[PDB]
Amino acid sequence: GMTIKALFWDIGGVLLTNGWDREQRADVAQRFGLDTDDFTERHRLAAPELELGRMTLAEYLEQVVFYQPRDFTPEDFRAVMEEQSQPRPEVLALARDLGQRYRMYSLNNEGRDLNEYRIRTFGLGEFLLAFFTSSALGVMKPNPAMYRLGLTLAQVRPEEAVMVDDRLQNVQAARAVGMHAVQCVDAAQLREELAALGVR
């Protein structure tokens, strides 16, 4: 087939843990003594706009946490949010290796502040050339438009690209715009499937 010219990488659940998923929020909420039902409902409402970069973290925190007096600060809270991010060593290592031979980019959903913390903390920029992130672009996976935008920014044809994501819905959406895609289950599996596409 066409030679692959670019890889697009999901970050959460692939390169790193998710930044602010259900399980993590549950944990952090407990630590801060938050009413979990109210917190979850408020997060549900506000999260998408944070993810799309149309509301600030301060704004989100105002609605989701600091809507009543608290015995801690937004800075305190933000610190603990940031700390939820941990590496996925084997996949990271694979990506770092491949980055020596291929042009690669992120295509991921994440609020700006957590995104930038994750990039700097884990040196994602050493192997990803650009970060096509929801909070920067104002669209989010699994919107077909996000995939198309990534392709447009990288200037590669759909068939010359491969999307790596842990969610089947995202893999399928990528394929629907003409991209190759592989669902990331584990490093060994991902390496083999990429190799099948000529990405070694």
* One-letter-per-residue 3-state SS of the chain: CCCCCEEEECCECCCECCCCCHHHHHHHHHHCCCCHHHHHHHHHHHHHHHHCCCCCHHHHHHHHCCCCCCCCCHHHHHHHHHCCCCECHHHHHHHHHHCCCCEEEEEECCCHHHHHHHHHHCCHHHCCCCEEEHHHHCCCCCCHHHHHHHHHHHCCCHHHEEEEECCHHHHHHHHHCCCEEEECCCHHHHHHHHHHCCCC
State which residue, 65 or 119, has the beta carbon closest to Na ion: 119
- Taking the complex as a whole, the smallest distance from the CB of residue 139 to Na ion amounts, in Å, to 16
Using CB under 5 A, pick the residue from 6, 7, 9, 13 that binds Na ion: 13
State which residue, 10 or 193, has the beta carbon closest to Na ion: 10
166 near Na ion, rule: CB under 5 A = yes
Residue 90 CB contacts under 8 Å (≥ 6 apart), including other chains: 186, 187, 188
Using CB under 5 A, pick the residue from 7, 8, 9, 10 that binds Na ion: 10
* Residues in region 74-113 near Na ion by CB under 5 A: none
- Taking the complex as a whole, the smallest distance from the CB of residue 167 to Na ion amounts, in Å, to 6
Of the candidate spans 13-21, 36-44, 62-70, 121-129, the one that interacts with Na ion by CB under 5 A turns out to be: 13-21
Of the candidate spans 57-65, 70-78, 159-167, 177-185, the one that interacts with Na ion by CB under 5 A turns out to be: 159-167
19 near Na ion, rule: CB under 5 A = no
51 near Na ion, rule: CB under 5 A = no
- Taking the complex as a whole, the smallest distance from the CB of residue 10 to Na ion amounts, in Å, to 4
12 near Na ion, rule: CB under 5 A = yes
Residues in touch with Na ion (CB under 5 A): 10, 12-13, 166
